[PDB]
EfCDA (Enterococcus), 528 residues
Amino acid sequence: SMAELKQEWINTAIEALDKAYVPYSHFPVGACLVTESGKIYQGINIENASFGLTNCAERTAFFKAVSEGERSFTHLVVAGHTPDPISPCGACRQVMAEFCAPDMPVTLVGDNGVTKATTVRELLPYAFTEKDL
Amino acid sequence: SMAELKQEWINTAIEALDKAYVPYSHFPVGACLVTESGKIYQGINIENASFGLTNCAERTAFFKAVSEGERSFTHLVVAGHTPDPISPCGACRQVMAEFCAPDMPVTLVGDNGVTKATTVRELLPYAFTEKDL
Amino acid sequence: AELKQEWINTAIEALDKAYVPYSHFPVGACLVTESGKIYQGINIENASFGLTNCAERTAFFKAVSEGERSFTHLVVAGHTPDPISPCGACRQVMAEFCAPDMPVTLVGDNGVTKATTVRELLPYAFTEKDL
Amino acid sequence: AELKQEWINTAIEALDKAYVPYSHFPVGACLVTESGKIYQGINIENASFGLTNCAERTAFFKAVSEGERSFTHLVVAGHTPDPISPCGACRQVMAEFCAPDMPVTLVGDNGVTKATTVRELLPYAFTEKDL
Ligand SMILES: O=c1ccn([C@@H]2O[C@H](CO)[C@@H](O)C2(F)F)c(=O)[nH]1
Ligand SMILES: O=c1ccn([C@@H]2O[C@H](CO)[C@@H](O)C2(F)F)c(=O)[nH]1
Ligand SMILES: O=c1ccn([C@@H]2O[C@H](CO)[C@@H](O)C2(F)F)c(=O)[nH]1
Ligand SMILES: O=c1ccn([C@@H]2O[C@H](CO)[C@@H](O)C2(F)F)c(=O)[nH]1
Ligand SMILES: [Zn+2]
Ligand SMILES: [Zn+2]
Ligand SMILES: [Zn+2]
Ligand SMILES: [Zn+2]
């Protein structure tokens, strides 16, 4: 079922918290990006001594997937060690809008099983696109 | 009046379109960031041969203002040569959320006088903050 | 410095796989670990140009996400008359994860190449030591 | 290379002005134009670390937004035992707007300094030539 699959994706994103490279913030974030073909891509945040070159977990998952030729995504899970479900930052929301349909579901996870259901469009309303370039 | 001030800010953002450094996209964006003290900061997008080091007009305005000690913002105008009012990208929305109140008004401008009224919260719902760091 | 044709092939083959709808300027990377495992990178652009990710960083983000921490070589290729140059942001990510002396091979069109290292590309590198 | 105390003062004074609630690691910059006009930079962090902007880039974004295109010197200061090092991203922005030979002065605590140039900090610099 869709709910049982979502729990395996949640597990993938939560396990990513243990793989994060965060020696400066000590704030791990995990992601599970799911393709239309069923393949999952796990993302971690990856920091840099120069903070601005840090890459978020959500973007790591997209860059992994897109590098393998993936262009059709059906779900994204993001997890954090947070009392409420973790929130993707605006930069990640913009990468999500580049590759995903507006109505693609996004599940946000925090500690102690808390979750929030949303979509790409709800996280980034009136999204900037390539339309006018 | 608030509406007459908003038109001077709109003019500032539109004039910024002529100052943009966009030799690669040729897509200028202008910004007018207004402080509680009445001071305005004009932003332009500034590209780099390595595209990822490009800085948006909205962020240029914030970096100018914050570098002068500004921490209290009351309005942001963003303008583009676009048929509908220009949309700030997610990265800019995240910088807006760092420094602005959720309900701070944002005016988006396109060509031929088209405008859209919104706020920091509406552009970036459920915003990620420093709360859990 | 050792240079395997597989590594060159990995970086050049990536040129056809890049996500570059805005620049049409593909960049390819092959990042090699101590075990010999290879990670291919492509540049991945965004309608907001400043969210673009370079091929070199894509390769590092892939490898680091799989737990790799020991790198022995990086090949970078472009469709360029001289060997392609990694940008400064990529050089800083390379310095995060690689030894100063780790070899780097830069490739352009028609077989032009240039051999260098992490330290030569980023002298007097900024590190975390004073944070 | 000419070095004015005003420029050093501008970069060091910026250390007290930085927006660094996450690292508490301030960086200051003084960017000088041909006309002698100076632009002060600070690093400006973000709760999402990857949206942080460096002091060097803040100075360039300020100057370029005011129409400046001719730069003659960059001073960068940190509270560091050795002169602070610009990160690779900053070096790439410097290469966008500065001559290869434009002088750069790096400053640390207790008056330690190091003189360099844009080209020495970013050898074999990537440019727009093949786009
Ligand atoms: O959307 C987001 C927002 C933040 N993070 C990570 O939080 C830490 C502190 O910023 C950094 O390592 C990070 F990369 F920004 C994500 O992974 N995704
Ligand atoms: O929010 C935004 C989104 C895009 N832009 C600019 O559009 C051009 C094409 O991406 C680039 O120069 C730019 F910087 F990204 C902004 O200025 N602000
Ligand atoms: O070091 C580098 C420098 C540039 N590129 C790519 O060139 C295009 C134009 O900037 C963008 O798509 C890109 F990502 F920045 C790399 O992949 N690596
Ligand atoms: O070149 C550089 C390298 C780092 N910094 C600043 O150091 C802190 C920790 O990375 C961040 O606040 C910062 F912005 F990246 C600069 O200002 N310039
Ligand atoms: Zn993010
Ligand atoms: Zn933006
Ligand atoms: Zn790069
Ligand atoms: Zn920097």
